[PDB]
């Protein structure tokens, strides 16, 4: 349902 929703930039910066 929310596939094409906007990006806000709250992505976790993955280390591994």
């Amino acid at each position: 349902d929310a596939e094409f929703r906007h990006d806000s930039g709250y992505e976790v910066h993955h280390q591994k």
């Epitope: 349902d1 929310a2 596939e3 929703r5 906007h6 806000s8 709250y10 976790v12």
Partner: antibody, heavy 119, light 106 residues
Framework: QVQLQQSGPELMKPGASVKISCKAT????????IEWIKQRPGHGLEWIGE????????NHNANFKGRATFTADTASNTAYMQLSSLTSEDSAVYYC????????????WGQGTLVTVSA | QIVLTQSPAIMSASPGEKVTMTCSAS?????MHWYQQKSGTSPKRWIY???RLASGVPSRFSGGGSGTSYSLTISNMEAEDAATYFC????????FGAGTKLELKR
Amino acid sequence: QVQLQQSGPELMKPGASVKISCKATGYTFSTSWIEWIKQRPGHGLEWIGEVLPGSGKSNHNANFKGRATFTADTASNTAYMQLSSLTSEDSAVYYCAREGSNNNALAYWGQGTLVTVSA
Amino acid sequence: QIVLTQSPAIMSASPGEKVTMTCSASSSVSYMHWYQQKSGTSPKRWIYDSSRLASGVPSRFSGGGSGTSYSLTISNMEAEDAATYFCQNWRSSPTFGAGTKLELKR
């Protein structure tokens, strides 16, 4: 405080088009997305789409097949959802919502608009 | 790609009892949002970013988890806590879980 207020209930004939409004206050209208959520009893909560006011940008749920259009009027701080070719399946409570200040949870919700599609 | 499963669908808790409801993801997710809904009213943001309580949410509520399993916990069940709780994550499809209906046990 951020507030979202929706237009009242709509009684519709099958095949008609409905336009629901969402008046936004307490923040800069052009810097946040107004999002739309469908709720039927026995179906939970479904994301329908969104508009970024003053940008001309909108995003859609593909399962709605272009029947849902999302617009905004920056002069009156009001966002709009239009749903055409209404069926009994479209009978639901429709919410407008917005992200939090420093989080992407839907912190702010409209009171909901009941759409009843009936002959 | 990522499916959310709320177990169980109906949860029964006596007044005073500790309550834990789980939102399981089919693959790892970095956060979980939780929303409270009572009959006839809009969902309210309840717990956001896995553990952060919204303004006005009582201290008996808490949230936690990581990866494929997240939870909402009530330390002592009160009558006003009876509602449906939806878990939610934007990387999930559908984005909202089916909901856990929390009722009073007798």
